[PDB]
Amino acid sequence: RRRSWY
Amino acid sequence: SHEQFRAALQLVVDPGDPRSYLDNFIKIGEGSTGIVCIATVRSSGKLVAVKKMDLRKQQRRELLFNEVVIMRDYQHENVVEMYNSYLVGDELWVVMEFLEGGALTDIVTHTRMNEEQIAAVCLAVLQALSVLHAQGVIHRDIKSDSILLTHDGRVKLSDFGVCAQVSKEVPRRKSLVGTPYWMAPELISRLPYGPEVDIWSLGIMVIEMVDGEPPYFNEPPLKAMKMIRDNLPPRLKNLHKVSPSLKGFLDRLLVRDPAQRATAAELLKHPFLAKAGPPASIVPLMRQNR
Predict the structure, then answer these.
(1) Which three-class secondary structure state does DSSP give residue B105?
(2) Where are the annotated segments for GEF-interaction domain (GID) (chain B)?
(3) Given B176, B179, B220, which is nearest A3 (Cβ)?
């Protein structure tokens, strides 16, 4: 998965 | 509360609605903060890009200010220029430069890059970072998806929505931010950290550029982080496929101890960048030329 935390 | 936050952005964004001078919005992408559209400047016929971010959909809405800080304060040959920002309903819109060559991701997942091309990418990224780092800005989401290309192969850093600033009063950041496979070990360990995290993240992107994928990509995000945090630095799946100039370069980047990792500014002097070709060398890699 290429999705980012913030 | 949401209304409260709308009111705050309004004080900070440009007045009006860019729908009044743009036609033909066409969605071309997503990131984590929202969507990206192409639009047509009615009067010129030129293409610009438009980042739309729904306020109601952010984990941390206050990071949306990062977009304004950068526009206002850090603009540079290897950073995507932002032109103007607006509040349109419940959305923040950033009208910015359109990188018509797309993301590095599409290249890395469909062709092989030679070391001339790899080195040109790194050189361009490091020029961006050495300047940003010099002013206390840490991007915190370096990966191929954040690297965008012009039609003629110029390389620009993008997507600042989760960046932070350090300085003498705030020498370190602490927040858990980024994309799992790319996160530095000390940031997964919840240690305070500085610009060193972009350098590690860039190493992972070097491995993307070589293997097509970051390491432990076949593991779910949480297992990957544990292994990033607990294990020896991740290895190239194909070491016989990088010159020892590339292997040496990477060994300065994937360093566990953040105090021993090279900085952007040192890395600009690394012999491996001597191989960097002109932007024109990147051009054949794009979907429209393959």
Answers:
(1) helix
(2) 1-24
(3) B179
Q: Is B143–A2 a contact, with Cβ atoms under 8 angstroms apart?
A: yes
- Search chain B and give the residue with CA nearest A4: B179
CATH of B99-290, one of 1.10.3720.10, 3.40.50.2030, 1.10.510.10, 1.10.10.10: 1.10.510.10
Residue B175 CB neighbour total at 10 angstroms: 15
How far apart CA B245 and CA B251 sit, in angstroms, is 10
Q: Is B29 in CB contact (< 8 Å) with chain A?
A: no
What stretches of B2-53 show up as alpha helix (H) in DSSP?
Answer: 2-10
**Following CA atoms B26, B56, B195, B221 in sequence, which dihedral angle do they give, to the nearest 10 degrees?**
-90
User: How was this structure obtained?
Assistant: X-ray
DSSP designation for B272? G
Per-residue tokens: B172 = 């370190």
Note the residue count of chain B.
290
Resolution in A: 2.4
> What superfamily does domain B1-98 belong to in CATH?
Phosphorylase Kinase; domain 1 (3.30.200.20)
